[PDB]
Design a binder for this molecule. Sequence first.
Ligand SMILES: NCCSC[C@H]1O[C@@H](n2cnc3c(N)ncnc32)[C@H](O)[C@@H]1O
Length: 393
Amino acid sequence: VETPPEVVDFMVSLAEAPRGGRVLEPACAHGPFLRAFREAHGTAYRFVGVEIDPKALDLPPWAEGILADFLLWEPGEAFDLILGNPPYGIVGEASKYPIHVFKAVKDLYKKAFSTWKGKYNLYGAFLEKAVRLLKPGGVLVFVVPATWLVLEDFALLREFLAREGKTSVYYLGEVFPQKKVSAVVIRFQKSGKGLSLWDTQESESGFTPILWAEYPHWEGEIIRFETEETRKLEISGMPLGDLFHIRFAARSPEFKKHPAVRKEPGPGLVPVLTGRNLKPGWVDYEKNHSGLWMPKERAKELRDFYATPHLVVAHTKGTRVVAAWDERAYPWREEFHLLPKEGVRLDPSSLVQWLNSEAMQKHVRTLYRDFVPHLTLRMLERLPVRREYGFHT
DNA sequence: GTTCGATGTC
DNA sequence: GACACCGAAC
Ligand SMILES: NCCSC[C@H]1O[C@@H](n2cnc3c(N)ncnc32)[C@H](O)[C@@H]1O
């Protein structure tokens, strides 16, 4: 991976270190950040780079090169400035995940990192590691995916950062050519507290940061681009999640194992539905995208709630709210399934038209832009609903 | 019981 | 450039 020059130059403008200060680049390869910071701020620092691949490591002689897994690396002294672009990726089995390490190494990661949660990500580990290796008052400048702002895998990371110092987040979006990742820059300083959220505008040479909002009391809550529009909507309405039990569909292997599930259409078999069957305001009951068929009346053996018509909301159509009422009660292999809480009664058509409204599409795009290519549970449960828009107690 | 994607597909 | 994983992982 190459970090585009304008991205590097932006990060370097946010980078500060005392003269004589220790300046580290994790996962450095040839050390573009060390080169760039030296170019900009001068020669009077101790430059250090850590690189796991002896073939990749190629620092200039003025910098100390270290052959090490940065995540397991225990240097003698902490650092004044840490900058770079860590590896992004989930550590898992090669058939599904891009990061492949010997099980014992992954075990060491889980052991070393307090923020490690769920499948997690190499970049979350690099972020926590960077903070633990920082002197008080020390500065971190990383470019990472936006996903940590909102995702549950990084809930510990956000809490960690919020208690460890002060955090500035700069949204860049999709800045890496021929590479599908919405990026942010994090400038973290190991002192003080609070979050600052910034937008950016692209310049000829770098990025111009524009302050969006401040949260001096941030404790690790999800990070969103809130406006007066999004705030009014939320305070005026009820959150969807106070009205509904929200579940996800049974997964592919759960259908695979089921003794009445077939790979072929036939007598008394209904398609197992996917996200492609879910449409704004309706369901495609015909087309099969799963490769799986089963008897409709046996669906409830996977999930109880497949037995009754209920609200289905999309998960993988980007940051959007695509909802339908499944009136036929089919087996689903995908999507959110929302079942009314005790005492909650619904008007399915009003609720579906409200959730599919352009007003709603705007609301979620404002808040979550393109951090993730999903509508997540965290987003969905916070969708505001008024009783006129299809619920009563 | 459900999450996540330096991506894949078209 | 729109719209989707799907199953290993916990
Ligand atoms: N900084 C540019 C992208 S990150 C990719 C680089 O980081 C290196 N890398 C990946 N994992 C590493 C680790 N755990 N410790 C040090 N370097 C690592 C790779 O060898 C590669 O050179």
